[PDB]
Every structure is written in structure tokens, then in C-alpha cells.
Ligand binder design. Sequence first.
Ligand code: CDL
Ligand code: PC1
Ligand code: 3PE
Ligand code: 3PE
Ligand code: 3PE
Ligand code: 3PE
Ligand code: DCQ
Lengths: 347, 98, 110, 169, 48, 314, 171, 80
Amino acid sequence: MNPIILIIILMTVMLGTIIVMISTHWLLIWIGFEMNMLAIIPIMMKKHNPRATEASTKYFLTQSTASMLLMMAIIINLMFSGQWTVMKLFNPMASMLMTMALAMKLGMAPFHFWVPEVTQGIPLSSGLILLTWQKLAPMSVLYQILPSINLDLILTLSILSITIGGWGGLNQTQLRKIMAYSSIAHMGWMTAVLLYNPTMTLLNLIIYIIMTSTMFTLFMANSTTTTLSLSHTWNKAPIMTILVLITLLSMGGLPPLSGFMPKWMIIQEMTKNDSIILPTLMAITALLNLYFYMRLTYSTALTMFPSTNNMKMKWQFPTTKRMTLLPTMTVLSTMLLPLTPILSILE
Amino acid sequence: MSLVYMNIMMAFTVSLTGLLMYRSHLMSSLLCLEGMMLSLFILATLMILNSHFTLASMMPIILLVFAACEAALGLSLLVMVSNTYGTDYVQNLNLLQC
Amino acid sequence: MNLMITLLTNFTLATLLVTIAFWLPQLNVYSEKTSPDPMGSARLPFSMKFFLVAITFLLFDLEIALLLPLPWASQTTNLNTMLTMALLLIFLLAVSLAYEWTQKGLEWTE
Amino acid sequence: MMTYIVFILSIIFVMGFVGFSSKPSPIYGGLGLIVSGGVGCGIVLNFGGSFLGLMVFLIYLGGMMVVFGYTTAMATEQYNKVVLGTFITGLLMEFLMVYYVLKDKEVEIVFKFNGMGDWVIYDTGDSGFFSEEAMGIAALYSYGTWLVIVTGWSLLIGVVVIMEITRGN
Amino acid sequence: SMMRWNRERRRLQIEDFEARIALMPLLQAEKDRRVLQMLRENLEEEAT
Amino acid sequence: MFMINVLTLIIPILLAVAFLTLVERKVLGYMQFRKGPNVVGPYGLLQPIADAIKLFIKEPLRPATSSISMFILAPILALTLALTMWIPLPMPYPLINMNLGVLFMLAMSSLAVYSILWSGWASNSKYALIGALRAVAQTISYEVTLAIILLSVLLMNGSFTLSTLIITQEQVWLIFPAWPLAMMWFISTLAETNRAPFDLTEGESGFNVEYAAGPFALFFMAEYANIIMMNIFTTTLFLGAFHNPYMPELYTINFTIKSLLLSITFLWIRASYPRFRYDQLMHLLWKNFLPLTLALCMWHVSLPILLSSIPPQT
Amino acid sequence: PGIVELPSLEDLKVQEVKVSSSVLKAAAHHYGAQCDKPNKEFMLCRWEEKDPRRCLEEGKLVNQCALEFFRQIKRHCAEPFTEYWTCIDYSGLQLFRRCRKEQAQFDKCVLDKLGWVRPDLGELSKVTKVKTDRPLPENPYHSRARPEPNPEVEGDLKPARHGSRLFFWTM
Amino acid sequence: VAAFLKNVWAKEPVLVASFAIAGLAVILPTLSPYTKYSLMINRATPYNYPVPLRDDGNMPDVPSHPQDPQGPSLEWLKRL
Ligand SMILES: CCCCCCCCCCCCCCCCCC(=O)OC[C@H](COP(=O)([O-])OC[C@H](O)COP(=O)([O-])OC[C@H](COC(=O)CCCCCCCCCCCCCCCCC)OC(=O)CCCCCCCCCCCCCCCCC)OC(=O)CCCCCCCCCCCCCCCCC
Ligand SMILES: CCCCCCCCCCCCCCCCCC(=O)OC[C@H](COP(=O)([O-])OCC[N+](C)(C)C)OC(=O)CCCCCCCCCCCCCCCCC
Ligand SMILES: CCCCCCCCCCCCCCCCCC(=O)OC[C@H](COP(=O)(O)OCCN)OC(=O)CCCCCCCCCCCCCCCCC
Ligand SMILES: CCCCCCCCCCCCCCCCCC(=O)OC[C@H](COP(=O)(O)OCCN)OC(=O)CCCCCCCCCCCCCCCCC
Ligand SMILES: CCCCCCCCCCCCCCCCCC(=O)OC[C@H](COP(=O)(O)OCCN)OC(=O)CCCCCCCCCCCCCCCCC
Ligand SMILES: CCCCCCCCCCCCCCCCCC(=O)OC[C@H](COP(=O)(O)OCCN)OC(=O)CCCCCCCCCCCCCCCCC
Ligand SMILES: CCCCCCCCCCC1=C(C)C(=O)C(OC)=C(OC)C1=O
């Protein structure tokens, strides 16, 4: 791609998400989602192979269906309220359709079935955009309509996302599908605390974006898309095994790491509202996520898989890749738990 | 409420269930998607013309234009699928199971 | 109402002439014909260029749809804003045409 | 009967969708969506949306379904039970809706719907020397500055996007 | 030529609009009595 | 009484299309230093009648169609659209006086490519389908400059009302402020009707070669109805005549003479030029007419504002 | 809810202005000049009361002052007015510009026999002021009392007592 | 700045005419003395009813009648 065209298209992706974040009219919400989808389609077809076209086709169909359900929710809101303010909705049918549309955009279960496919079909940078930046606009719309969201629906979507993202990653060896099922489980954790305390939703989103950006940046810096090529990292760059170790132990939520920070705070807000069974079962289900994280750490950091002979050639060349913000994101995704009361800046 | 809204919502649900149950062609899916858009256009239009809400009369045109651009993008994706397999059959798009 | 009558009359006269043109020479008993194209049986090769000119039509047609309320929009009292946005829409259609030019999109059907 | 005419068009509208949602072939489905666009345009025109109905013709039908039929004719090389069963299923469900809301003057599928003719919901005044819908669309250039900017930018970006993804390089 | 003639056409439009404006109070009074006539007839037949 | 008015619209359309074929053969005769038909009738006035009776008893060509239904629908759609383009035409009074008659005609002419597309797919010939796709791409290409030129002209009108376009041109023809729009408009209407030098359905297969003599004659007469109609619309749009409201036949005689001269100008352009190659009229549209059309659209937006010549809405 | 309060059919009886729209449009500028005061009293009452039932009598004054307008045309200048509205009436859009000599004869005859001056371009579209005796409505929308707002913030902003109070953090 | 202009007018007169007419359309309404009258004519066009004001007693600029001297005038439009 022309680098100017890449810059303009990424600015248009950012422009669509910012238009979702700043607008007060539902048509401009729908326009921001349309602009976001339209501009992110060339990011997914960056390498021009049939898997990228299949992934972009599946992504287009799911996001287009969600955009139509979003506009139907908007139009039913205009029926039953005669206005367009991006606020609570004035009909439970429009609220259900908008919650379904945003669950389709986030890829929350049972609308999750596109997320491990599309992330597999696209490069690591476009998968990073899809799993970090593409969550921000629907979580903003869910942030602003929470006086109308059905509790039973949002918690059903949450627990179904956490369980299916837990069981889905246990069978994987491809790293992008592992990050995609990790995405489904973490979006379940974000929407489970939305009606209780949306500041903890924003906290979980920020810590998730930091940890996912760290893991995709490590996968780009080591050029590894599979488990078994990630296991060659100790013979190529031994520091990267330490970094994937501490970041995967963070993403499982082990204290004293910072990925323990969101889910604990989520439990801290779900027991105030007299829900004990639900965050307990959520926390027990997150052990599955931690299990396949531990599988990746056993393959990469804590053991040494056998390498090949041609690795000895790559010993003579340092990494020329711009590992952008990788030490910053590595420090932030691990050593941030002593600064847990910083979360009040998200209120 | 009014009787024409029943038919326009039922049209949106019929085009929904057509778009949610693929047969073989991706073009038929795109036609169901644009039927969903057309019913949204009609429903928005009948409300805004009924309510005499003047500033939203430019709203359905916008709802047309973006979504037709969306349709263009969908057609382009279909063509790329058709330039890989020769057909736009949705069962050819199954490589991402593994 | 008069429009619907006129459409029905035009459609009925068209259907009547098509029925006459498909069934007046069927009354003859001419002969049965056995009758056993530049391409013989080769499948139609896809042209990327015909699809690109149709999509370029579709996108410029959407930009035209935006341009269509200008004879009404000239009547406004916010004329500086109206003129700025009219020139901006026609300029963005021109920038779309220029980008379609410079990346060789208008080639071999120029 | 003529007081129900928009309703009648809407019935045909729903019938037209059971045309292409059952998906016989994308070309007959294209034809069914064209007929659906024409009758939905008639529904729009009978409330006073003249400009919006001519946008359905010029831009949806004459603009976009032309490109759908054009792209479709460059595929699906020229020469079912599920289609026929789906079509009769949708038609019988729609005529049961018609029968219920005409025998009862009220129905409730998801929302409550009156069964009177939809002429009853109109306004009893005049708009003077202008169409209100024409002036609301004319306000796109005076009041709709941000909407014009984001729409024209999305169309320019859409041109760029189609030229990037249809190139293969 | 279009300058001179469209300025004349705007003046003729203002003359038509001021004829309309001068007629609107009579039409508004007749419209009010019209709709109250119809509502009183509907009320009496609802009563019977 | 209104049905009589519809019949006195659409039966003279068919008669004028019938004798336009004679006028074309005669005028193309004398421009080619020969005569046209003068044997069959006195001065050849029975040539269209004889040819209609010949074509309506010719053997049906009997194709194997991919679709029977669209093969029937394409002549029906062609004739229906070619007859409904006439009903808002103010000559001096339209049959249907509608507020948005210009946009109505632009819409109903945008729908005319489906007859070409459906007849191309309804044939089993792949080469006929390729010709249909080329003809549709040509027509939808020139519709872009139709819409933008037409918008730029109606910026001087004030509305989409076709009858207002007579009031607009009472002091001067609208070809004087808009002759570059008029000449690109005229060549774009020449390319809409697939008329020479843009007739690639006869340049070396047409989209409608599988039709029998009757239905192909119906396509042919829908095409000539479109030709006469677009010449009348161009006459109304740029050469608007004097109209005395107490004597409407003065306007009828005047627009009739101008529309006849413009149809003969179509006949005289096909007697003068070779065809374009297909990419060459694509080059003519996208790289020549469309940049000038966008530039003149900017000019005709900004020009009533800078001269204080904004036309009235009503 | 309540019962709607409609005026009786006797309260709606008035001597109508039974003339066609070309008669009204041909006399429109002199009607706006001569019948200014009851018309603007009625339209001020109509935009202030937002209820036609509260505006009936003024409306009757309109329907009383229009007739006295037309009788004074019928007593003096019936034939130039008749020729003029006939020429207006021929046009399907009822153009003023087609009928300037009949307008000139009617304006001449009215200016000589009644002294009425036809308003210039701009005058009938002016916003005028109306002296009334009816009171200004204190609640034309028939609205109830608004809810009291939430209590605002006041006072100095003290630091958080012993910090965040988040489980063990002392700041 | 002059050889390039004669070069592009020799090669591409369609595009030179296009950019020239577009440049005139951009810059010329800001240089025209009659752009003000377009605004003044569009605000002089009475689509709505001139809803009168209640005479409080102190409004010296608001007329009591259309034929009064005070109020907005259209002498500039009749004269130009
Ligand atoms: C005249 C103008 C100038 C005046 C100057 C006056 C000062 C002069 C001296 C200048 C230097 C001052 C340094 C800061 C003051 C002392 C802070 C302190 O000790 O807080 C006690 C703090 C609470 O004890 P305390 O008896 O209640 O308070 C005594 C004071 O009143 C403490 O006051 P407080 O109660 O107001 O403290 C507030 C609150 C008090 O704390 C709390 O409310 C409790 C919550 C604390 C965080 C708990 C997080 C639990 C989960 C994560 C566990 C971390 C893993 C362990 C480390 C892994 C390996 C690095 O602190 C925090 O929440 C901040 C977080 C902890 C950071 C403390 C400062 C560290 C600076 C250097 C960092 C180097 C790495 C240290 C280790 C990294 C982890 C801390 O102790 C702990 O939490 C124990 C953990 C160790 C704390 C860091 C010790 C700092 C000195 C390290 C030097 C050796 C470095 C060796 C190499 C690097 C490591 C391998
Ligand atoms: C409506 C009534 C009739 C209207 C007039 C039409 C009658 C004459 C018709 C003759 C027969 C035509 C048959 C088809 C012809 C097709 C070929 C053809 O002509 O192609 C078009 C040709 C194409 O030229 P070309 O393709 O030969 O040129 C070569 C181009 N390159 C280098 C790219 C290969 O010309 C145009 O596109 C021009 C269209 C009209 C332009 C009008 C411009 C008006 C002046 C503007 C201002 C200029 C000064 C600068 C600014 C000053 C400001 C103060
Ligand atoms: C309430 C919150 C509101 C919002 C707050 C802000 C949210 C920020 C969300 C961040 C989302 C980041 C999305 C990904 C980056 C986008 C640009 C991009 O595509 O970068 C990748 C780029 C592609 O280069 P390429 O050459 O294609 O690489 C493949 C190999 N050839 O280049 C590369 O591949 C270089 C390799 C390293 C790239 C690292 C990028 C990290 C970006 C995220 C930083 C962490 C988030 C910011 C801090 C927390 C904010 C909440
Ligand atoms: C009950 C009794 C009637 C039964 C049904 C019949 C209905 C009426 C049909 C028409 C009249 C019947 C006779 C037809 C012609 C017979 C005579 C004939 O052929 O005369 C030849 C003569 C020209 O001589 P020619 O041989 O051409 O010599 C060449 C010059 N050296 O030819 C001429 O001079 C010209 C001949 C013209 C033929 C008539 C005109 C055409 C038909 C008009 C009506 C039908 C079509 C209506 C319009 C259709 C759509 C356009
Ligand atoms: C394959 C199928 C068969 C194909 C061949 C036949 C169909 C194609 C050719 C005919 C196309 C039909 C077009 C019908 C609508 C045209 C638009 C229209 O109505 O514009 C005229 C006018 C708008 O102007 P305006 O003056 O503002 O309105 C009157 C206010 N005084 O508005 C009016 O005057 C409004 C009049 C009342 C409303 C008329 C509604 C018409 C009936 C519904 C649509 C019928 C066509 C459906 C099929 C389309 C093509 C598939
Ligand atoms: C600022 C006002 C608004 C401007 C934007 C709106 C313009 C309205 C018209 C829309 C035009 C859209 C398409 C424009 C594409 C331009 C790029 C281009 O065509 O480059 C290629 C061309 C050489 O053509 P080639 O590639 O060989 O194609 C085969 C034909 N020979 O290369 C060329 O021919 C060179 C073209 C550039 C030079 C043109 C100079 C004209 C100068 C006129 C006077 C100044 C007018 C004021 C504006 C500034 C212009 C720079
Ligand atoms: C309803 C039928 C009316 C009469 C038919 C149309 C008028 C006669 C046109 C004859 C004709 C001529 C002269 C003709 O030259 C020609 O070939 C190009 C045709 O197409 C096959 C024709 O149809």
C-alpha cells in the first residue's frame, strides 16, 4: 500500500471511532461505525491472499448485519421517543436490538463466531487494530445506553462470552486465535460489570488494550504466528521469552501483576451489588484462560524446545523492527498493580 | 400504532431472516442486506414525513448513501471471492476453520 | 391518481404490443427447424474493468445524490456556509475523479 | 378500499421481500428487490416524500441495483423446493397478518398495531409555498455542515478503499 | 439577461407571497371555524 | 376525458416514431448523395407501414432463453419507460404537471438500462452479454454528466418543475448562459440513446439480437421514442420558446419546429462521423466531459450568488 | 382525562366570504392595506393563545371586516375589479404579471373613488405592532409546575479523608 | 509559471479550462459586490407569516401598519 494512503486510511479508522465517541446524534453514531468498517477493510486486505479476502468478507457481513440492527434500534427509538439524543433508549425492543448489534460488533458470544476466523485471516498489525481499537466505539455506545440495557441479556452475553472464550482457547495452537478467544473472554468480563460500575468497565478495557498491544507487539517483533515458532524465541532473543512470560502471567490475572487489577476490581463491584455466585463462577472460568496462557509460557519461556540449524544465521542480525512502545507497554502491563487507585481518573 | 409500520417492520424481519439463512450465493446475501437497508429507508421516511420533523428529512438520504457505499464495498469483496474460486459460493469461504 | 392511470395505460399498451409481437406470428405454421457465437463453450471471463467502472458510477452517483438539493439550497439565508459546502462537495467529487485518474483506474476504458 | 391503498402497497412490499429473501437466484432476487423498491417508493410518495421517492428510483434502483444486476450478470453463469416452500411460508404468514389485523382492526406481533387505514394519522394543515421535506433536504447545506463533511469524506475514502482492495497488490 | 430576469422573478415571488400573507388571516379564521365545525359534528354524533 | 388525453399523447408518439424512420432514411439518403425511399408510398410515405406489416408477420426467431420472464420483461420495460418519459413534458402544458418532473425524467431514464441488462442476460449468447454490459456501462457513465449538467442548469431555474423552465427562458434562451453545458448535454444525450457516433451495438453484436422481428421492432421504437423525447427535453431545457397563455399552439408550433430540427441534427450527426472505440468514449466521459462538468457545476453554483441572480423557489 | 370543551354550532355561525381564490388574490394587497387592524389582532391572538377556540370573536371580526372591504368594492368599482379578477382567474398559477393593465385600471379606479393606495414591495411582509385590550396569557401551554432541580455543589473542596480508602492504600 | 502554463494549454486544454473555471468559481464570489444582495434578497423573501408584536407602548421602530414609514424597506430591491 502507498504509505500516504495507509496514513489517510488509518486516520479514517480513528476518525470513525472518534465520531462515535463525540457525537450526540444516533445517525452520527451509525455513520462513525460505517466509516470505521469502510476504512478498516483495506487494513485487513493488506497482503492480498485468499485468507484475507475471506476474513474481510466475514468481517463485512457481521459488521454490516450489526449496522442494520443498530439502525433499526435507532429508528424504533425515533418511533417511541421522537428524537435522536445518544442517551438511554425508550423501548426495550430497541434496547435489545442495540445490545445485540453491539455484541455483534464486539464479537461477544454467541456472536463470537467471526472473531477467531477473521483474526486468523489477517496480519498481526490489523489483528491488533481489530482486537484493541475496534472495541472502543461499541463500548462507548454501551457506556452511554446503560440505563436501558437489560440486565439478564448483558449478563447472559457476559457469561457466555467468558465461558466460550475460555474453552475456545484451550484447543488452539495458532497465536491469533488464542488472542481472539482471549478477546471474547475479556469482553465478557467488561460487560459483566457495565451496569454495576462502568468505570471498572473502562479500567478493564484499558488494561486489556495494554496487555493485548504488548502481546501483538511481541508477536510482531519476533515474527511468530504459531506456538511452535514462538518456541524458537529463546534461541533467537532470550529477553522476549521473559517478556511474553510476564505478559501472559499478567493476562491470566495472577497477582502481583496488573492484569489481576481489573477482574479483582470487577469482583469488588459485583459483591457490593449482592452478586456472589456470578463473579465467583467468572473467576473460576478465567482459570481456563490462564491455562492456555500457561501452555504458551511452557512452550516459550520455562522450557527450551528444539531449534533448527538455520537459526545460527539469524544470530548474526539484530532486530531492525520498530518495536514501538514495547518496553513502555511491557512495564505498564506488569508492574501497575501498586498504582491500582489511579483508576479514579476514569470516573 | 399505524398499520403501514407493521408491514415495513415485517419486511425488515423477512429480509433479516433471509440475510441470516444463507443458501449458496453471496450475492443473494448482499441483496437481503440491501433489502434490510431499503426497509430502514422506508420506515425512517414514513416516520419523518408523518412527524413533520423537517431537519431529519435529510436523514434517509444519508442512510441511503453510506449504506450504498457499503453495498459497493460488499460487491467488491464478492468480486475478489469470485476472482479466487470462480463462484461466489459461501461454502468456498471455509479456509479459516484451521 | 392521474399518474397511476397514465402508468397503467403505458404499461398496458406496452404489454399489449409485446403480446402481439410474441403471438401474432405464432399463428402461422411455417416449418419446424432443427438448427444444430464467437466463443464456443468457454465460460465468460470476468472483466475487472467493467466492475470498476460500474462501482465508480455507483460512488459518483452517491455524490450526485448529495448534490441534488442545490437548487433548493440556494434559497437559504446562510449562503456563505451553503456555498462553502456546495463547493466542498463538488471539490470532493473532483478529488475522487483525480484519485481515480492517478492510480490508473480509468485505463483501457479511460 | 382506496383508503387503504398505502397499506395495499405495503402488502405488495412485504410480498416483494419474500421474493428475494427466499433467494431463488440473485437475478430473480434482484428483480424482486427492484419491484420492492418501486412499491416502497410508492409508499413514500403517498405520504408526501416526492424527493425521497425519486431518490429510491434514481439512486437505489437506477443507481445501486443497476450495479447489483451488473455485477451479478458477470457471475452466476446463464442456463427450487426450498425457495418455493419459503415463498409460500412467507406469503401465508403475511396473509394471516392481513386477516388478523383486518378482522380485529388491531394486532400485536411485537408492538400493537391499529388496523385502520393509515390515512388517519395525517396532518390537516398546509405547508404554504414549500414542501417541508424539500426544505429539510435543502438544509443539508445550511445546517448540515458536519454531516456533509463526514459523508463526502466517507465517499472519497470509499473510492480509495475500492481502488485499494480491487487491485490485489 | 438571467441576472435582470431572476431579480424580476424574485420581486414577483415577493408580490405573490405578500398576497398570500394578506390573505392568511381570513383563511386562518375560516380554517378555525371549519375544524371546530367538524369537531362539534363528531362530538354530537359520538354522543348519539 | 383524461384517458383521451393519455391516448392523444401516446398514439402520436407511436406515429411520430413510425415516420421518424422514414425521415431518417430520406435525410441519410440525401446526405449520402442518393435518395431515400420514394417507391413504396408517394415520396415513400408508406415505407414505415409496409415495414411494420413485414416485421409483424416475419417468423419468430425462437431463441433458447436463459430466462423466459426477463426476455418478456425487457421490451415491456423499454416501451413503458419510453412512454412515461413524455408525461411531464411541458409543451406548453404537461399531461402530468408534477413538481419534480426533471428528477422524474432523470430517474425513469436511469431505469432504462435494465431492459438492456435483462435482454443481454436473457439471451444465451455470452457475446451478447458482453455487448449488453458495454452498453449498460456506457449509458450509466453518461447518466453522470446528465445529472450534473442538468443540476447546473436547474440552478438557474429555481426548481425541478419542467413548466417553470419556460418561465425561466422568457427573456433569453438558456443556451446563452449555458452553451458549454448545452453542448456536453447534447453529446451526452447522443450517448444515452446509443446513437452514432456512440453506437457500439452495431460496431464490430447487439444486446437484443435474440429477439424476433416484432419484439426487436418494439425495442427499436422505444429507442426512437427516447430520441424524440430527449430532443424535446433539450429543446425545453435550452431553447425554450415564447408562450402566450391565451394561444398555447404558438408554443406548440415553436417547440415542435425546434425539436424536429434537433432530431434531424441527430440524423445529421450519424451521417457525418465514424464511431468511437469503446475506450475512447469512456475517455470522452471520464477525462473530458466530467471535469468540465464538475467545474461548470461549481461555476453555476457560485454564479447566481456572485451576481445576485438566484431564481425563485416557486 | 378531561372532556374537551368545544364551542357550539351557533358560536361558529358567521356570514362567510363566499368568493373564489382569484377574487381574493386580485384584491389581496388592498385587503391587507385596508383590513390590517382586525387581521393583526386576530393573528396576534392566534399566536398568543395557541387555541382557535379562544380566538373566535376576533376571527368573526376578520369575517366582518373582509365583507365591508368587498361591499365597498361592489358599491363603487365592481366592473374594473371584475375584469381584473377574471384575467387573474384565467391563469393556472394566477399570475399578477399577466394582468398589469387590468390591475392598473382597478388601482386607478380605487385610488380615485376610495383613496386606497396599493402597498409597495415589502410592506405587507413587515412585522407590525398591535394594541390590544385582552390580557397576555400567563400559561399558554397549560403547563404544570416543573420539578425542583437537584441540589448543586457548594463549599470548598477538602482532600479525601485518609486517601483512596481502597483496601490498604494509605493515599 | 508561464512556459508550464502554455505547455498545459497546448497539451490539455480541457483540464486548463476545468481548473480555470473552478478557480473563478472559488475566488470570484469573495470579490463580487453583488454577493451581499443575494443574502439580502433571500432574507427579504417572506415564506412565513409576519407574526405581529404586542404593543407594550415603547417600540418606536415597529410600525402599526404596513404603509407606515418605520420598518424594513425594499427600495434597494426595486431600484438596484
Ligand atoms: C523536604 C522535602 C523533601 C522530603 C523528602 C522525604 C523523603 C526522603 C527519602 C526519599 C525517598 C523516598 C521513597 C518513598 C518513601 C517510602 C515509600 C515506602 O516505602 O512506602 C512503604 C510501603 C507501605 O509501608 P508503611 O510502613 O505503611 O509506610 C511507610 C511510609 O509512611 C510510606 O509513606 P506512605 O504511607 O505515605 O506511602 C504511600 C503508599 C504506602 O503504601 C501503601 O499504602 C501500601 C500499598 C503499596 C503497594 C502494594 C502493592 C501490592 C502488589 C504489588 C507488590 C509489588 C511487588 C514487590 C516488588 C517487586 C520487585 C520490584 O505508597 C504507595 O501506595 C506507593 C506504592 C509503593 C511504592 C513506594 C515507593 C517506591 C519508590 C522506589 C521504587 C523501587 C521499587 C520498589 C518495589 C516496587 C513495588 C512497590 O511499603 C510497602 O508497601 C512495602 C513494599 C516496598 C515499598 C517500596 C520501598 C521504597 C524504597 C526502595 C529502595 C530499594 C530499591 C531496591 C531496588 C528496586 C527493587 C528491586
Ligand atoms: C443543444 C443544442 C446543440 C449544442 C451544441 C452541439 C452542436 C455541435 C455538435 C457537433 C457534433 C459532435 C459529435 C460528437 C463529438 C464528440 C467528440 C468531441 O467533441 O469531444 C469533445 C472534445 C474532446 O477533445 P479531444 O478528446 O479531441 O481532445 C484531446 C484531449 N486529450 C488531450 C485528453 C486526449 O472536447 C471537449 O471535451 C470539450 C467539451 C465542451 C467544452 C466547452 C468549453 C467552453 C469554454 C469554457 C471556457 C474556456 C476558456 C477558459 C476560461 C476563461 C474564463 C474567462
Ligand atoms: C478510554 C480510552 C480512550 C482511548 C484511549 C487510547 C486508546 C489507544 C488504543 C491503541 C490501539 C492500537 C492499535 C494498533 C496500532 C495502530 C497502527 C498500526 O497499524 O500499527 C502497526 C504498524 C504496522 O506496520 P507494518 O509494517 O504493517 O507491520 C507489520 C510488519 N510488516 O506498526 C508496527 O507493526 C510496529 C510494531 C509495534 C506497534 C505497536 C503499537 C502499540 C499501540 C498501542 C499502545 C498501547 C495503548 C496506549 C496506552 C493506553 C491507552 C488506553
Ligand atoms: C373486406 C375487404 C378487406 C379485407 C382486409 C384488407 C384490409 C385492407 C388492406 C389494404 C388494402 C388491400 C389491398 C392491398 C394492396 C393491393 C394492391 C397492390 O399491391 O397494389 C400495388 C401498388 C403499387 O404497385 P407496385 O406493384 O408496388 O409497383 C411498383 C411501382 N412500379 O400498391 C400501392 O399503390 C400501395 C399499396 C398500399 C397498401 C395499403 C396501405 C397499407 C395498409 C394500411 C392498413 C394496415 C396497416 C395500418 C398501419 C400499421 C402500422 C403502421
Ligand atoms: C418489472 C415491473 C414492471 C416494469 C414496468 C413498469 C414499471 C416501470 C415504469 C413505471 C415507473 C413508475 C413510477 C411511479 C412513481 C414516479 C414518481 C412520482 O410519482 O413522481 C411524480 C410526482 C412527484 O412530483 P410532485 O408534483 O411533487 O407530487 C405531486 C404533488 N402535487 O408524484 C406524484 O404525482 C404522486 C402520485 C401518487 C403516487 C404514485 C405511486 C405509483 C405506484 C407505485 C409505484 C409503481 C411502480 C412499481 C414498480 C417499479 C419498477 C419495478
Ligand atoms: C482551485 C480550484 C479548484 C480546483 C479543483 C477542481 C477542478 C475542477 C475540475 C476537476 C478535474 C478532476 C480531474 C483532475 C485530474 C488532474 C490530474 C491529471 O489529469 O493528470 C494527468 C495529466 C496528463 O494526462 P495523462 O495522464 O497523460 O492522460 C492522457 C491524456 N493526455 O496531467 C495534466 O494534464 C496536468 C494537470 C494539472 C495542471 C492544470 C493547470 C490548469 C491551470 C489553469 C489556471 C489556474 C486556475 C486556478 C486553479 C489552480 C490550478 C493549478
Ligand atoms: C406498434 C408498431 C408501430 C410500427 C413499428 C415501428 C415503425 C416502423 C419501423 C420500421 C423499421 C425500420 C424502418 C428500420 O430500418 C429498422 O432497421 C434498423 C427497424 O428495426 C428492425 C424497424 O423497425
